[PDB]
Amino acid sequence: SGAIYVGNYRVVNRHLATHNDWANLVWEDSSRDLLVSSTTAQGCDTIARCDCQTGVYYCSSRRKHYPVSFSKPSLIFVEASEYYPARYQSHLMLAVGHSEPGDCGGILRCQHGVVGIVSTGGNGLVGFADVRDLLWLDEE
Numbered sequence: 001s002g003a004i005y006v007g008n009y010r011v012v013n014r015h016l017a018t019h020n021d022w023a024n025l026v027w028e029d030s031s032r033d034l035l036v037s038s039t040t041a042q043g044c045d046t047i048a049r050c051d052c053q054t055g056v057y058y059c060s061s062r063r064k065h066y067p068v069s070f071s072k073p074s075l076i077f078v079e080a081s082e083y084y085p086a087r088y089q090s091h092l093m094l095a096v097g098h099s100e101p102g103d104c105g106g107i108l109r110c111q112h113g114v115v116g117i118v119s120t121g122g123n124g125l126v127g128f129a130d131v132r133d134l135l136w137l138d139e140e
């Protein structure tokens with residue numbers, strides 16, 4: 001579990017969105033595994049606006065933050081799960097790092113701010129849904 005709290009937005013994995021998230025929906029995209037809902041309180045996270053390929057992510061199944069090198073946002077086949085059919089997830093970045101199913105939501109960050117959240121992984125991989133292209137998270 002986990003979310004990004006920037007401005008009056010809450011960014012979560014679409015597959016982990018709550019009823020309250022759906023009832024206060026701003027934007028969602030199944031192909032990216034992302035959903036954004038509106039919040040009453042202002043958040044403290046800042047979004048990175050860069051092309052970094054090195055950063056640090058939080059792994060809840062180890063209670064640890066790990067430095068990682070990650071690929072550029074791309075399309076990558078993600079194996080069928082209880083949440084989506086076998087398919088091409090977009091804007092996804094891969095790294096070598098420990099991950100297990102409930103780690104979705106952990107933040108990946110670089111020197112510029114939050115880069116994205118854990119969405120996939122496996123056999124020593126972890127994948128992140130990028131948010132750096134969502135410029136509207138910084139305003140209104």
Ligand SMILES: CSc1ccccc1CC(=O)N1CCC[C@H](S(N)(=O)=O)C1
Binds near residue numbers: 015102119
């Ligand atoms: C950290 S996820 C993980 C880790 C180790 C092993 C397996 C997984 C599960 C995983 O890859 N899933 C299941 C939840 C839905 C995502 S997604 N990206 O939204 O299609 C895909």
Ligand SMILES: [Zn+2]
Binds near residue numbers: 048050
């Ligand atoms: Zn950066």
